[PDB]
Amino acid sequence: FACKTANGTAIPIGGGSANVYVNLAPVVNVGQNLVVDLSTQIFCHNDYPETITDYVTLQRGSAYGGVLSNFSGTVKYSGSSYPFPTTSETPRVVYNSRTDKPWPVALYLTPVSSAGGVAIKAGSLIAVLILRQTNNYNSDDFQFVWNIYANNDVVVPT
Ligand SMILES: CO[C@H]1O[C@H](CO)[C@@H](O)[C@H](O)[C@@H]1O
């Protein structure tokens, strides 16, 4: 089991960490969602589906910088929504193919009433998402840590 980003940054068997740089809608109004869909930038696969089933969760998601201060967050994982920053590990998604499958994580971030102006700074860390991989074969319990950075400013109109 291993993962890679859209630009080819890899985290190999056994886990590790990587940086993911995301383009963000440049203007987001109070009452609207800023959507950060990581399923277009993070992909994983099972290296031995003949014998092993891999299990993959969002173990935790943490907010940083302007996302922590200026947004009210929800994370959608494989079709279900939960609070973000997260309050529990999600259910498991099965990985059972050698063909890359997206990691089905999306953040939905809506501005808090106090938000206004440059609510997310370009280049800043906005989230850390911990992907936890286990299986039905051995005791493997690995963390794939995704540090998510904004590529651009996000302005909340006032
Ligand atoms: C040792 O086998 C590797 O590949 C299998 C199948 O993906 C994983 O379950 C396991 O944790 C390792 O990453």
Side-chain angles (χ1 to χ4, degrees):
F1 180 91
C3 303
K4 58 175 148 75
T5 69
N7 83 341
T9 309
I11 308 181
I13 285 163
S17 67
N19 299 330
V20 186
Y21 298 87
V22 298
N23 297 317
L24 299 173
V27 176
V28 182
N29 287 279
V30 174
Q32 300 185 334
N33 285 321
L34 172 65
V35 176
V36 189
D37 183 5
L38 282 315
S39 73
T40 62
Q41 293 192 240
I42 300 176
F43 306 85
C44 303
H45 74 281
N46 180 328
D47 282 296
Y48 195 16
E50 293 87 354
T51 298
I52 300 177
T53 303
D54 290 319
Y55 305 123
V56 173
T57 66
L58 177 62
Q59 192 185 4
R60 82 151 158 265
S62 303
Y64 292 95
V67 170
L68 184 64
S69 66
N70 296 313
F71 291 81
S72 175
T74 301
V75 56
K76 275 199 183 189
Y77 189 61
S78 190
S80 291
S81 296
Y82 312 92
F84 174 84
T86 59
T87 56
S88 66
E89 177 169 26
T90 65
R92 292 169 286 173
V93 169
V94 171
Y95 279 72
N96 51 15
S97 176
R98 198 171 269 113
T99 299
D100 296 327
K101 167 157 85 164
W103 191 41
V105 177
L107 313 173
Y108 293 79
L109 310 171
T110 194
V112 300
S113 287
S114 60
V118 181
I120 294 167
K121 302 185 176 75
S124 65
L125 179 72
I126 61 166
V128 169
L129 310 177
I130 302 183
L131 182 167
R132 179 182 185 184
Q133 178 250 323
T134 55
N135 60 37
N136 71 343
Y137 182 78
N138 62 20
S139 68
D140 289 355
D141 192 344
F142 298 138
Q143 288 176 324
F144 292 69
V145 181
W146 308 98
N147 305 304
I148 315 305
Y149 291 88
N151 274 333
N152 57 276
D153 288 347
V154 178
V155 162
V156 177
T158 50

